[PDB]
């Protein structure tokens, strides 16, 4: 402890500090992955000659589409190049599986009562009331079909 | 206290949804005094939505309505999605179709507040950045004319450099910053370097005398 302290006094602290992932920045890093994978699979299917300008637009389509999945809006972009619609539906189903599994995983953890945060109880109430109304809206639709 | 909708408040709400979106209803009720974000949401989803269907009744619609209201008795939110129409209009016509068998003084200030709020998009951070940028240039313009007025007296006072924030802060003016020289080529740029240097020293001689 004191060997680190005095060498920090005599040399400063390191510029190369890299932050490992923890519980607080888990969903934030899961975003930065999910942005980059959709960046690659769409920048590989473009014709040729654009990199920086479509990245703004096409990831805002993802963020809008992820909101529409969370809201059970069907997310119809009117004229959309159908391979890109295949991509954005694919990763949002991928993010759906992580989002739904963490909702089941934390709900079993709360019922056991084994060290859940005060915030995570409200976050899990939010995710399950999304999923209960989705199950309700699905049940209304297949009754009407 | 449950008020009626004036056509003034009707135009604020349409301009509100046009900027804020259909989900930010408490943003809408902030512009809209006396009205609720529930009430704001309710009118846009029952009256003001231009997707809605306020028109005449074809006989197909009237035969479809009397079918649905017989098959789905009293399910008007259900029938109005089948008819793709608003619901209380759908009830109003079903009331009428069965009758066939017969035997600024204040508002403008609200509008002036709403007109200013919709046209101001920045927040604290951008407006403060604007203000600090104007005040920084005002300090700069003051300091330059100081040196000119002292130069009117003949006494020369140099411009002070900005203070270093951190240790290795770079004076970009002092040197070629990160001098990436071009790759050494074959076509012998020897006379061309002499003519830029002669032109660049000529340009510095003109700024001392005529001043750009």
């Amino acid at each position: 402890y004191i060997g680190n302290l005095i060498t920090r006094q005599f040399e400063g602290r390191s510029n190369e500090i890299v932050k490992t992932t923890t519980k607080q920045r888990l969903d934030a890093y899961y975003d930065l992955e999910l942005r980059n994978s959709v960046m690659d699979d769409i920048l590989e299917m473009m014709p040729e000659s654009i990199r920086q300008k479509k990245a703004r637009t096409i990831l805002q389509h993802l963020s809008e589409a992820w909101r529409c999945w969370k809201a059970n809006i069907p997310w119809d972009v009117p004229g959309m190049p159908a391979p890109i619609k295949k991509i954005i539906e694919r990763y949002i189903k991928s993010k759906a599986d992580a989002w739904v599994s963490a909702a089941h995983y934390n709900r079993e953890r709360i019922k056991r009562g084994a060290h859940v945060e005060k915030t995570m109880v409200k976050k899990n109430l939010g995710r399950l009331t999304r999923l209960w109304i989705k199950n309700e809206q699905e049940r209304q639709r297949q009754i009407q079909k | 206290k449950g008020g009626v909708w004036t056509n003034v408040e009707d135009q604020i709400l349409k301009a509100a949804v046009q900027k804020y979106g259909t989900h930010q209803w408490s943003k809408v009720a902030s512009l809209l005094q006396k009205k609720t974000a529930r009430q704001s949401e309710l009118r846009w989803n029952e009256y003001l939505n231009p997707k809605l269907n306020f028109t005449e009744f074809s006989k197909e619609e009237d035969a479809q309505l009397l079918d649905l209201a017989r098959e789905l008795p009293n399910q008007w939110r259900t029938i109005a999605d089948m008819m793709a129409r608003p619901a209380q209009v759908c009830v109003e016509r079903y009331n009428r179709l069965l009758e066939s068998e017969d035997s600024e003084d204040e508002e403008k200030e609200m509008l002036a507040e709403a007109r200013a709020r919709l046209l101001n998009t920045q927040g604290k951070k951008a407006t403060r950045k604007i203000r600090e940028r104007m005040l920084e240039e005002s300090k700069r313009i003051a300091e330059l004319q100081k040196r000119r007025e002292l130069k009117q007296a003949g006494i020369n006072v140099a411009i002070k450099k900005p203070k270093k924030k951190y240790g290795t802060d770079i004076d970009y003016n002092e040197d070629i910053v990160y001098e990436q020289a071009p790759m050494p080529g074959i076509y012998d740029t020897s006379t061309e370097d002499r003519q830029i240097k002669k032109k660049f020293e000529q340009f510095e001689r003109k700024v001392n005398r005529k001043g750009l």
Binding site: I6, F10, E11, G12, S14, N15 | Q180
Partner: protein, 127 residues
């Protein structure tokens, strides 16, 4: 044809063309057993000299557990005996060592040609 070579010397046509297209049975041999050992023994000696540099420079005393007097200076006139100073174990070793940040210049002597192929390209206005 006064300067035939000096245009784009680093690119040729031979770099574009495949080599298995002349014969599908061209032999590219696996590396021989005498050749992998000359490369393993050079690399293992270089990496072990790097791990010993990392451990001996760390201030942990428990790092020597896991691990030259001669260079003619000018020429022919001076033979120099190079020794090490027995440092005070309380004053910090590596006195000129601080956590400072440097930006590095990129040394480029040659341009790598970006050897794509082709000029389809028809755009259906879509995308």
């Amino acid at each position: 044809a006064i300067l035939t070579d000096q245009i784009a010397k680093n690119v040729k046509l031979d770099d574009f063309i495949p080599k298995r297209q002349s014969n599908f049975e061209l032999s590219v041999p696996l590396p021989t057993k005498a050749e992998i050992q000359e490369c393993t023994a050079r690399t293992k000696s270089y990496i072990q000299r790097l791990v010993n540099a990392k451990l001996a420079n760390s201030n942990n005393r428990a790092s020597s557990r896991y691990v030259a007097p001669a260079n003619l200076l000018l020429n022919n006139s001076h033979h120099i005996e190079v020794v090490s100073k027995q440092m005070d174990p309380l004053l910090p070793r590596f006195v000129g060592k601080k956590a400072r940040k440097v930006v590095a210049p990129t040394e480029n002597d040659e341009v790598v040609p970006v050897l794509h192929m082709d000029g389809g390209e028809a755009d259906p206005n879509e995308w």
